[PDB]
Swiss-Prot record:
GO cellular component: apical part of cell; extracellular region; extracellular space; plasma membrane
Regulation: Interaction with ATP6AP2 results in a 5-fold increased efficiency in angiotensinogen processing.
Subunit structure: Interacts with ATP6AP2.
Protein name: Renin
Family according to the record: Belongs to the peptidase A1 family.
Designated gene of the protein: REN
A Gene Ontology BP annotation from the UniProt entry: cell maturation
Keyword Transferase: no
Compartments in which it is found: Secreted; Membrane
Length: 337
């Protein structure tokens, strides 16, 4: 094809980057996360019981008001690291930044308050492969590819650092290419181990001088939907000990005064070193000794086949403009701007 389509994203507190999609005729609009760590499209359904408070706060899809709706009704359960959703399959017309696709998506009827009440987004757009799609439903990007409209069989992610300003731009996804306005230098491509998962080989994690972890290799899933960089509980508990961070219920803290003194964290990928400074991974809300600052790193035990793995989420993507190459089954990284 000849076309490139861009989706503008909203940056919510550096943890959620969401765009807009339209479903049905006339379009019903939803705030969605474009997730490379999953392959299914879902939105909350009007058929969701209002005893799920998450369904009371989010925008619901009503099939009754869509003229393009095609019923299916097959049940589906989508299990994620942070929680689970259930619903049934439905078919309709989806609009993603100028591209219109006939897509099979989940109408969510069971949506727990934890974590979904914390979500600013209503639904999810899975950017993974059909190999990871629950119910073997064709993912949205495969359907866009089938239209033969895109210049390249690629998609890119730009996540902005700045969240507290307007006119700034929260982020951007480019379908069919990369925006050279948002990166500098050249892409360094790392090939995927196998097709089916946006996962690459990682050959070490360095805290300061020493390569404290992942010597003899480990895995790294490049997940656009993950707020933070994650590792296994054992890798994390070890990394956090090295930094001097204190384990809480869910997230790790450090004394705000100690934040800028923290050592650099480096990730060995495709023979290159991808380094994060303490400015990149500490939520530096203050410098007070009497205050605690959160780190944009946490533990996540991802079960097999995918895991155990590290996950390079928004924390990593903010520093490195990421290109997802479906044609050559590789991931490209470049310094973001
Ligand atoms: C963001 C997201 C998604 F895109 C698809 C499915 C589930 C989630 C929820 C969700 C996460 C999640 O389970 N996944 C798995 C599939 N790929 C995306 C990340 C998640 C992860 C793993 C984190 O390390 C940190 C926050 C997370 N949020 C989260 C963020 C903000 C508020 C509440 C939760
Ligand atoms: C739902 O869609 C799938 C497409 O893979 C089809 O094989 C199945 O029979 C459908 N069920 C209904 C009730 O339309």
């Amino acid at each position: 094809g000849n076309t490139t389509s861009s989706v503008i994203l909203t940056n919510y507190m550096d943890t959620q980057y969401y765009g807009e999609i339209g479903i049905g005729t006339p379009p019903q609009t939803f705030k969605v996360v474009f997730d490379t760590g999953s392959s299914n499209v879902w939105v909350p359904s009007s058929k969701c019981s209002r005893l799920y408070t998450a369904c009371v706060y989010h925008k619901l899809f009503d099939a009754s008001d869509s003229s393009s709706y095609k019923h299916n009704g097959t049940e589906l359960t989508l299990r994620y690291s942070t929680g689970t959703v259930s619903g049934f399959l439905s078919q309709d017309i989806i609009t993603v930044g100028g591209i219109t696709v006939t897509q099979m998506f989940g109408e969510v009827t069971e949506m727990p308050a934890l974590p979904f009440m914390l979500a600013e987004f209503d639904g999810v757009v899975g950017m993974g492969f059909i190999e990871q799609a629950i119910g073997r439903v064709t993912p949205i990007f495969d359907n866009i590819i089938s239209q033969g409209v895109l210049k390249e069989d690629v998609f890119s992610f730009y996540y902005n650092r700045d969240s507290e300003n307007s006119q700034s731009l929260g982020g951007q996804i480019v379908l069919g290419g990369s925006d050279p306005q948002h990166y500098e230098g050249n892409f360094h491509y790392i090939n995927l181990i196998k097709t089916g998962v946006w996962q690459i080989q990682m050959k070490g994690v360095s805290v300061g001088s020493s390569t404290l972890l992942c010597e003899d290799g480990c895995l790294a899933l490049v997940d656009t939907g993950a707020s933070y960089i994650s590792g296994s509980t054992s890798s994390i508990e070890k990394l956090m000990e090295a930094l001097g961070a204190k384990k809480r219920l869910f997230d790790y803290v450090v004394k705000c005064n100690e934040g800028p003194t923290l050592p650099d964290i480096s990730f060995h990928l495709g023979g290159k070193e991808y380094t994060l400074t303490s400015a990149d991974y500490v939520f530096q809300e203050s410098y007070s000794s009497k205050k605690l600052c959160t780190l944009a790193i946490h533990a996540m035990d991802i079960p097999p086949p995918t895991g155990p793995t590290w996950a390079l989420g928004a924390t990593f993507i903010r520093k490195f403009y990421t290109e997802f190459d479906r044609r050559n089954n590789r991931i490209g990284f470049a310094l973001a701007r």
